[PDB]
Amino acid sequence: ESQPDPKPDELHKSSKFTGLMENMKVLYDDNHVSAINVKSIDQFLYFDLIYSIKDTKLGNYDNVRVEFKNKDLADKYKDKYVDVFGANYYYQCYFSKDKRKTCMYGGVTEHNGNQLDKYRSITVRVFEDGKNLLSFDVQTNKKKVTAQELDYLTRHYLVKNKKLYEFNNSPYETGYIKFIENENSFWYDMMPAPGDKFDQSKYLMMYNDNKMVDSKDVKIEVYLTTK
């Protein structure tokens, strides 16, 4: 469907978050899950799938527990060769009731039939206090791509280039990423909820719907504001 743009006072303010911004930042830092053409090898709960993906640096294999908002999504991708790309975590990563066992949400696309021979550019338009000063491209080889994956590439870029989640040097109070596909749009709040704690597991669960977009159609807008 479509989604109303943020009402005034709806967006999370970093000034009102008194925890570690570091714990938001690590999620969009260099480390992430990206595997190509793999199939689930196990499952813990009915709403998840477990992949075995290689670590090139240490030579071993790690397990990734991918979590979806329901059984239907897990059921869909279960015995399928896929691509997995997402912002993973460890703190409340459960394989039962730890570098080799990471968790994530969504980030899964069928491998076969989703490959372009030539990559597509998707331009991100960064607005700071209403002004499109920065724009940059992210390139994908996927026809249908998770919003998660685009969100990651976008924020990573911003973290490194614009100090996005620098606890001390970030200029930004407010932040949302808006995805536009035809006339329909949705957005995510890029800032942690107020108070003194931040739950990595809970924040990232917004990707467990596995939302996909078309990489030729989607436009990305990021709206930041300064303090």
Add this chain to the structure above:
Amino acid sequence: QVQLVESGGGSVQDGGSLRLSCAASGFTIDNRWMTWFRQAPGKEREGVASILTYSGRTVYADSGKGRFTISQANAKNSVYLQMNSLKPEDTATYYCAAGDAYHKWFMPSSRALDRKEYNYWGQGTLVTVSS
């Protein structure tokens, strides 16, 4: 195995200054809290300063406020404690401790000065301050 070796201690007069070093080996300074403690004879170990190496964020106990500064040198795999306006009260053995390296997570600052959190401690360096 993890090792922490402190240096830069010594014997000074009220108002003096020292710089403590801690060389770590067996692990990197990265992505953890590194912390300076001190212990008078017969008192418990107390936290004086900590730095989250991921971000350079710092926590200071009331005792060193306005007087001490903690810092890191990633290239040297070491942390440092600048100690200024020393006073006889600061006479303690000073210890460097390494916080745990959690995967993509850092423990809240409220616990950085708690000794119970730390599994890796150096020998310590003595600081004495004449009145």
